[PDB]
Amino acid sequence: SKIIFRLLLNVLMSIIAIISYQWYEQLGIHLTVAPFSLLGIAIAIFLGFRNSASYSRFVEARNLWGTVLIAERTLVRQLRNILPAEHDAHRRIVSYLVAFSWSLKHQLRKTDPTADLRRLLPEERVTEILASSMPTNRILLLAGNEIGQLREAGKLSDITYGLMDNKLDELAHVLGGCERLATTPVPFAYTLILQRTVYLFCTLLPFALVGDLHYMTPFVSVFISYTFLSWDSLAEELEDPFGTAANALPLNAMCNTIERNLLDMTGQ
Amino acid sequence: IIFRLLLNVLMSIIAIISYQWYEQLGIHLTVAPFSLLGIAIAIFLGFRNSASYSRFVEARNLWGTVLIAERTLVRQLRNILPAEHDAHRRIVSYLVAFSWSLKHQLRKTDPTADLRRLLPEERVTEILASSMPTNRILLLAGNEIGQLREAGKLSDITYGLMDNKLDELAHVLGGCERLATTPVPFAYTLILQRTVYLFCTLLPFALVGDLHYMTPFVSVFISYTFLSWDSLAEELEDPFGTAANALPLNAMCNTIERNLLDMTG
Amino acid sequence: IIFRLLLNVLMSIIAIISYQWYEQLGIHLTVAPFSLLGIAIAIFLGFRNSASYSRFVEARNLWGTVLIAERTLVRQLRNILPAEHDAHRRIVSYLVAFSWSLKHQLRKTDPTADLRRLLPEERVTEILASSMPTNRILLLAGNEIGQLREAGKLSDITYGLMDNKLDELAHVLGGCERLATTPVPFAYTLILQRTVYLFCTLLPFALVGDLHYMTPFVSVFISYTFLSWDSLAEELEDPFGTAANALPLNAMCNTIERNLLDMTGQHPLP
Amino acid sequence: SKIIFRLLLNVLMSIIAIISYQWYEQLGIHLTVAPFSLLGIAIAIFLGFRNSASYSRFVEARNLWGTVLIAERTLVRQLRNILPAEHDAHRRIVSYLVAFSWSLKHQLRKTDPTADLRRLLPEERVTEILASSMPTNRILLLAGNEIGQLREAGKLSDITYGLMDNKLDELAHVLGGCERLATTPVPFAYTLILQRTVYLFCTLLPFALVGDLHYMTPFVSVFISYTFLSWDSLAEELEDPFGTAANALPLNAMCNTIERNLLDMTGQ
Amino acid sequence: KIIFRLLLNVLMSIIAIISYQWYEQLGIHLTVAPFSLLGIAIAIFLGFRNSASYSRFVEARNLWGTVLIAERTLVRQLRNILPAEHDAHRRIVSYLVAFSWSLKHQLRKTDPTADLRRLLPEERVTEILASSMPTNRILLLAGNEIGQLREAGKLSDITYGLMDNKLDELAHVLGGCERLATTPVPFAYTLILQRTVYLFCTLLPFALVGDLHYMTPFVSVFISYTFLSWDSLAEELEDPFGTAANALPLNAMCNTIERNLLDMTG
Ligand SMILES: [Zn+2]
Ligand SMILES: [Zn+2]
Ligand SMILES: [Zn+2]
Ligand SMILES: [Zn+2]
Ligand SMILES: [Zn+2]
Ligand SMILES: [Zn+2]
Ligand SMILES: [Zn+2]
Ligand SMILES: [Zn+2]
Ligand SMILES: [Zn+2]
């Protein structure tokens, strides 16, 4: 990664620090570790408070997608527990439930849900989902019609309707939550203040080290840079929880984890 | 944007051109007390920086709940009362006015323009004549829900479902007004911001013996770190304000209007 | 409060004048042990300040819920029973009296005058004849909701909607009583106040070795930083007091009163 | 208490450090303070993260006993608004709610609740309570029958039963929480490491302080030891809030405030 | 203290003594200032890691505590609404106990076959085990048992709705217990911190032999053992559903759950 390919830049700066210092006493400039000890601790504190604030954003993103699996489990569970014979209406409500997660992933992955929506639904309902400015929310609205048309039919009482209605709210905070994380990210004034302070601290660190470390400088400076640049790279992976990176959320595999449950909850 | 930190560069350079009075007026300023003082300050600045971010998160979570609540509320009307679009455009218009009137209550601005756009003048005067306009709007939306209670159009259960989502909006109002009135006492932030700069200006006075001519480079680089982690924390304690890293409340109310209006049909 | 640092400059002034003799018993004082000691204090002073702030937030969070619960409860009355405006003015007074007695319960004041202002004396005398007066108000307001259920005006469902709004008010009482009756760091705060005062006074004795006569200039600045972070750290753990304390419940207790009265129509123009 | 001994033992090691200071400079060992700042700060960092772990557990312990206070209030209040005349059932559910608080306090103090059960309940029901595994859970089950025997007879609707039922679950989440705070203690595999890292640092610090401060080490070493030894000893009572510590929860007084409240809602 | 690598920290300390004197050449020197700053920088990051992992341990305990509480209240509501239908009692309890055990086997990745055959008929064990997420098949079967009491007219939908809210408390745990064991913090950080902690502990004695020649092995381990310990706790708290009996005793909680529901009948 860019961390590792720029961890090399301080090694030459350390040897540059070694090969310099010969005109230092003429100019009259000296660089010790005491100001960088103060500065380094101040940076490591701010990097730590920035990392734990980022970790919660990773946890909050993780909890919202975990609730989807919980809500749809119980919703299909309640449909097979209150209306066990309406297995014709089971697979319709399920199909909307499957479309929401995929449309959620494609809405958070900024891709095209057209291909995945036609797989589960007749084309009539796919464009109806695509006709609104928020297709996922149209699915929640569409899921209500399959639940709502059963209310006036006398199959579910108004309480049994409200109890299943209370399971779309758990689903509704997820869409409203995942949409909220990607539009209000951690204020960029944060990562830029740390990467501007970490990189500039890492480059000027060997200039403070060879006055006390002499030739052992490149070994120590890189080990301190590696610690900061790795601790900083953690903040860069927590900011993309819905992306395609090598170490992100496997949302394609998580939509798969949700689909195999509901389909085994009805038929196969 | 900066606190003219260049003045510490002059304060660092002043120590250099004064350093000629080093042993004559008998001054020693070492790094250990300023390291102790500086580490203690960066420790105290770290706990405040995360604390302001938390106030920022609570405001965004409340505004996200607003988008979710009105999302679900307009949805519940479309599943139980599929034909009652005469009451939709009234309940929706009240819900949209709630968001705009809330933002103007937190910005201490005038909500007159946005209310006349969505509601009739006769009821706009009804809203503006009260000491709590948002709760009066939420109260007005309840009348449109209450007039739907009637006797048999919505069951006794079904009213409670919409009542259980108007209170979700009310816990937002009680919080957002609480965040805009419950901050750190404006005498404890003041003692903290003035302590950082006093460490910031006297830091080069102690760094000359160590960093002779390299003093302004480190003094500014430590100034930049301390003055930034403190000045950004001053942007997050008022997420309803006009700061850079503030909540762009204009665009969230705009996103809610485009949501409900796309739900009308 | 302020002269503690003037005592600290004097400790430096004494430290300056009591160090030319600093050889009686062979003794030297360095800054490194006080850096470790000071950094450990800044770690512990930082963790103690965060605990006080949290109880301050819960005091605002619980008192913020007071505004919401009484709003939602009174608003619920104007959407289901808009014509029974006679029962509005009774529940409101209880909700207004609940907040006032809630403020009066935690400040250890006499709620008689504000209860005589808002309630008839028969309910004032019975409430003041109880030790837990606030819990009686929600119970008295609960009968107002129960009598509307027993008469046929509120269904078994709709009663439960308003009962869940008196419970939000009931969870407020038990929490505000919990923060004000068990401020747990009881008597153990002086782990820092006795250490900071002792650290700040012995600091110039360790600083006058490096900073000779310039010691008070730094000595007050490090003492000012620790003792100000300390006086702030114990101002927030009592979010119901006077002086600089940032909770002014009277303006919040009045605002809930003026809100429900403005939600019921108490400013008519003839 | 057991930190004044370590402080008295820490003063004695400093006097040994002075009278041995002349012995170990020939032995061929030298001791500076610089590792002890890193080690002490590393310990001072760990004492801060552990104190936050104990303090959070104490607040949760206090909140559960506040929740018992609130839930039984609402349950007694909900009973006085739906069945206000059923005072034959008032003193029965109140006694169950009161016995619940006491039996829980005896369950966390690991004593025998028989004595307070004969005071509040009929003796035959004391035999029934003691014949179960969890005595507290048997009490709330008894409170449910008094609500349950009122529903099937026609006095409580299916809805109004749930309104009071939703307040016994609030009491049940307390029992499992109070059970979790006790049955699942904070991970104490480090408390012994904190006994071993702090005292060995506190005792060996004056051996490193006698290098710079000659006679002033016992004055300084205690000020560093007392500050270190205080922050750890405070963490030892806050992680055990159901015991008989000086900061512990005075559970005796909480049951009294709960009983005197519920008794004040029943005409006394 | 099972760290055999803490003894490995001692060996370079004597090497540091025999080398400090043998290789001052070419200017390379190791002083204490960079490793003190670096050590504090690590101790800051190790503290933020333990509390983040510690919360993962706490969240794991609450999920199993909610399982204990949820099954309690569900049984409480049934003996207060249907005290006479004890023929149906012996069925639901077995599912909740089978759910409790099957959840522990799902997080421990062990075999629940015997645990289900003790409680359920072979035909229903074949139905549960011949499917994905057997715990959810148990809760779905437990839901079927509640639906038949509404369809029987024995439970109103209101009292049914009172009980339905308790299958979600168990389902939010299952979906929650699935979350803690499947997506922890990325491993690419576990090793870079294990490579940063162990490499810092081994390179410390080369930096300690300044004026600390003979006292080096005593301090290096006391700092390394202290560092190697505070990191090792975060490695047990990050996997609270793992093999470590000192992490979570699911056997002691699943049995404690069994002892309660079985104690309402004997
Ligand atoms: Zn089916
Ligand atoms: Zn419409
Ligand atoms: Zn509310
Ligand atoms: Zn009215
Ligand atoms: Zn409650
Ligand atoms: Zn009574
Ligand atoms: Zn529960
Ligand atoms: Zn039975
Ligand atoms: Zn749920």
Author numbering:
A (entry chain D), D (entry chain A): 22 to 289
B (entry chain C): 24 to 288
C (entry chain E): 24 to 293
E (entry chain B): 23 to 288
Text lifted from the article:
Here, by electrophysiological and structural analyses, we show that the neck and aperture in hBest1 are both indispensable Ca2+-dependent gates, and their dysregulated opening by rationally designed or patient-derived mutations causes Ca2+-independent leak and elevates Ca2+-dependent channel activity.
Interestingly, the KpBest P262A, G264A, and D269A mutants show no Zn2+ in the corresponding sites.
